[PDB]
Amino acid sequence: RRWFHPNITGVEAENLLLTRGVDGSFLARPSKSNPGDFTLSVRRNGAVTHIKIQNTGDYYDLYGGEKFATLAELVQYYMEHHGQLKEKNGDVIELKYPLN
């Protein structure tokens, strides 16, 4: 999957999304704080947000929400339902355009 950025830092994710993206662009990359896991770096209102993806070994989810068997499945749900990712305080973060 081309939105999957394997060896990229949150810093280079922000580099790419601010120079190569538009609002609504996103990518998944691996976690820094939790080695072996992933993170979604999404672009909203000219800045980048990072969302941790929970891999429980039984499913994937966004530490709450629908659960998925694969990462690409998760990304497709959120792409196909742009109202479904809300950040605690109500605000919606749309995953609209894969960065790549």
Binding site: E14, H50, K52
Partner: peptide
């Protein structure tokens, strides 16, 4: 980084 609070 600009990390969302997962909660």
């Amino acid at each position: 980084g600009g990390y969302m609070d997962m909660s």
